[PDB]
Design a protein around this ligand. Sequence first.
Ligand SMILES: [Mg+2]
Ligand SMILES: [Zn+2]
Length: 796
Amino acid sequence: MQEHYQPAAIEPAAQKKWDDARISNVSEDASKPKYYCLSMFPYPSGKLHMGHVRNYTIGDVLSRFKLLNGFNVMQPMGWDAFGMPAENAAMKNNVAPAAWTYDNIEYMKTQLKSLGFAVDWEREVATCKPEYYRWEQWLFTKLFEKGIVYRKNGTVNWDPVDQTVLANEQVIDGRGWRSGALIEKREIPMYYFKITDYAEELLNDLDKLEHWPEQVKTMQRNWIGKSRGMTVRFAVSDDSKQGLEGDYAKFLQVYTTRPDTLMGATYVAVAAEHPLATAAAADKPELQAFIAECKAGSVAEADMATMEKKGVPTGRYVVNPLNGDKLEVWIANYVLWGYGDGAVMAVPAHDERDFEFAAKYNLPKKQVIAVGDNAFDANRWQEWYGDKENGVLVNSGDLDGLDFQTAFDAVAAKLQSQGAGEPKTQYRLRDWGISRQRYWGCPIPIVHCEKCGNVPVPADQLPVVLPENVVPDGMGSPLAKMPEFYETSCPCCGGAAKRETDTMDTFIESSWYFFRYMSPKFSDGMVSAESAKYWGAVDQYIGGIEHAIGHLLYARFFTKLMRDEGLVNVDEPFERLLTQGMVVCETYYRWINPADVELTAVLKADGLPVVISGTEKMSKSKNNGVDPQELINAYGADTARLFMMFAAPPEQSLEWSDSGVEGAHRFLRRLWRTVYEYLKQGGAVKAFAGNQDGLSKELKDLRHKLHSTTAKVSDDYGRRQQFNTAIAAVMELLNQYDKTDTGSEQGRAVAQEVLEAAVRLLWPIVPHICETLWSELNGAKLWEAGWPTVDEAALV
Ligand SMILES: [Mg+2]
Ligand SMILES: [Zn+2]
C-alpha cells in the first residue's frame, strides 16, 4: 500500500476492475429485488458542466447504496440528442448537426467513464438514432389513426427576417430576439397531442403518488387547471342586439367558477374576437384599435398575469338572469378567445383581479359575500374577499345566508330552470402542439396526398429516416428545401406525395426514454413485453428543476398512453422524485472565467486585476462556467463527487468554492493515511463481533458512535436523501476514532470494524478510494460484504 493518496493511480484501475466483473450490467433477474435509479439524461452540449456532475453523482450515490443492499440496480444513461443547439453549432461551425452531435457524445461518454458512475453502458441510447425515434414515429401513427394525435390550423409567431416560427419566450416588444423584426401571427397547420382527453386521469393519479413532493403535485394540478363552475347566459338588451346575429344577438354566455357571486356582477368582459366586440367596434375606431392591440400581443403563459389588465367598454348591455341589473359589456385583454366561452363576468368585490380592474375604471363593487362581522372596505382589498369556504351571501335577496356549496347548487337550480344557465366542468389545460419547423429533430410520419389527405407512414416503412448529411444555412426549415427527401409516393394510392417536412418537439423523446432503457435493442416494439413487467416504473428520478410542468407531465401522459396500448402496466412513470439545486459560481469582468483567475483579484495569466461581480447560476453568459474536466485533472474524480455531495444537500443550491474543493481532497488524503497508518501498525485483523460486555469503556463508546453513524448514514441515503450530513456523520465517527487508544488486541478488532464500515458507508460517495482501502482491509468482494449492519447492542 502506497503511503500517500495518488488518485490517478487507483481510479482508472478501480474502473477496469468494475468492468471486469461487469457489476453494473444488469438484466431481468426476478431473484433480487429490482431498483430502477434514473438520472435525467443530458443533451450533448459538448463537454459536461458542473451541473451534470451533481445530477449523476446524486444518482450514483443512491444506486451504489441500493446495490450494496442487494438490489438489482438499473442506472442507464443516454443522450437527448435532438435540439436546436446542434443546428446553431451547424450554422456557425459549418458542421453537420449529426456529426457535431456524435463528436459531442463520445467526449462526454469518456468524461462520464472518468467519474466512475456505475452505469449500465449496455443500455446506452441516443435519440437521434433511427433505432430509437422510429418508435415515437410508430406511436405517432397509431395515435394519429386513433385521433389522439391530429392535425389542425393554429396561430403561431413567424419571424419574417430570420424565417422561422418563434415561441413567446423569444418575442420582445413584438420582435424576435435575434433579428429584432416585427413578428407576424400566422395560421399554419400543426399536429397536436389530444392531452386534454387524458386531463382527468393526469389529475387524479397524482393522488396515488405518495412520495411525490406536494409542491410539485400542486403545480401539475394548476397547469391542468380543473374547475367545477357554472355556464351563465346573459341576455343581450334590446338596445344592443344591433350587429349581432343568431344566438349572439339573443344572449351572452360566460363561464364562472364562483356563481355564488352572480348577484355581485357589475360588468362583463368579452374577448377581442367576440362578435359583441366586432359589432360594437363596427363604427368606433378606438375600439377597433384596441381589438388590434390585443391580437398583435403575444403574452407568454409564464408571463400571462404580468400584463397590466386593460379594456374599453362597448356601449352594449347584457342583462343578469337573476337580479335583472343591466350590465355593460367590455372588451378586455385578459379574456382569451378559444379559452372556453370567450367571455367572463366580473365581481370586483370578491376577485382580486376584478377588484384591481374596477378600481382602475371606477366601476361598481357590489359585495355579496360576508365572512363574519368583518368590515367591507370597497377601496382596499382584503383576503376575506376571495373566500369560498367561510362566507355566506349578503345583498343577494333570498340567497342571503347560504354557504358557497349550497349557493352554488341553488343558483344552478334557478339558472337551469330558466335555461339561462348550467353547471360545467372546465380545464385550463390546452392540447399539446408538437410541430417544430426545424430540421434537427424527429421527422413526423405523415405523407400528404391531394387525393388521400394526410396519410401516415405504415409500420412497415418506419422509420422515416432523417438525413444526416445536412448543414442548415439559417433561412427556414432545411428539410422543406430538400425534394430528394420530401418527394415520395402516397402509401395509400401511389401518386405523387410530399412528406411532412416538420420535426417533432424534442420533448417527445424525453417523455418515454425511461421505458426504452428496459430493452433498448428490442426490435419488435417500443419496450419489450417481458422487460416492462420486471422493471415496472422508475423507482427514483433525479434531474434539474427546469421544465417540470412540461416534461414531467408529458412523461405521465405518454406513460398512460403507452399503458393503454399493452406496452406497459404502470399508470405512473416515476415513483420517487428528487430535484437537485443549481450549481452557482461567482462572475468576473474587466466576462472572465473563474478557471483562469486568482484572488488577492487578479488574472491567472497576466496578473491583471479584474473585478468580481455577483454570483449567477453556472452559465456561459457571465463566463462563470467551471469545467469539471479541469476539476478532475487537479484532484480526481473522487474529490469532485465528494465535494458535490458535501457542499450542500441535493435540494439546496451549491456555491462553488475552490477552497471547499481542496477541503474535500484533504479529507480523502486523511482517509487514505488513516487506513494506511492502521495497517502499518500490525497489518489487518478480524473485525469485532458480538457481545461487548468485556471491552474497555473507551471502546464501548466508539462502537456506539460506529453503529450510531451506521444508522444515520443509512437514513441519510434511503430516507432523507441528505448526503452532506451523511459525510459529516462519517467524519465525526473518524474524529472519535482518532481520539481513541486502539493499540490493544480488542482495540485493533474494533478499529477494523470502524474502518471496514467507514469505507463502506462512503463507497457510494467516493467508490474508487473506498474500493481501494477496502481491498487492503478485507479480501472479500466488497459487494459480497454488503451495506454495514447496525448492531443495536452497541447502542444500549
Ligand atoms: Mg400507492
Ligand atoms: Zn394518395
